[PDB]
Write a protein that binds this ligand. Sequence first.
Ligand SMILES: CCCCCCCC/C=C\CCCCCCCC(=O)O
Length: 131
Amino acid sequence: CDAFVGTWKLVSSENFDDYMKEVGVGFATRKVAGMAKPNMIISVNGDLVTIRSESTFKNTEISFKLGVEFDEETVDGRKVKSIITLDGGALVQVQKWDGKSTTIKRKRDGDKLVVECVMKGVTSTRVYERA
Ligand SMILES: CCCCCCCC/C=C\CCCCCCCC(=O)O
C-alpha cells in the first residue's frame, strides 16, 4: 500500500452524481459534494492505513487495519461498516449500512490513483494525480 502513499488531487470525475444518487445521497449534498475537487491523503503507519479527503465542504478521515471491519461516517452523513482489503494491487473497500452495500476500489493506474465506486450496477470513476 506504499504505492498509494501521498497526497492526490482530483482531475476528472465520471458518473459520480449518478453513483451518489444510487447510494441515496440527498440533492443538496450531491451538488455541494460534486462541486468539489477534493484532495485525498493516504498514509501508512505500521499496519494502520489512513485515508483522508479534504475539501471546502467537509473533510473525512478513516484509519484502519486492512481486513478488520470498522465504523465510518461518510462525507454524505451515513454511518457504515467498512472493510478494506488489499487485492491484486488495489485497495478494495466495501461499505455496508441499512441492509445496503457499495464497493469503492482505489487503484494505481499509471501515475494516477483511480477511484471506482459501484452501487447496484451504477459505477463512477474518479481519477487523481499526485498533488
Ligand atoms: C456525497 C458523496 C458520498 C460518497 C463519498 C465517497 C466518494 C469516494 C470516491 C472518490 C473520492 C471522492 C472525494 C472524497 C469525497 C469527498 C467529497 C467532498 O465533499 O469534497
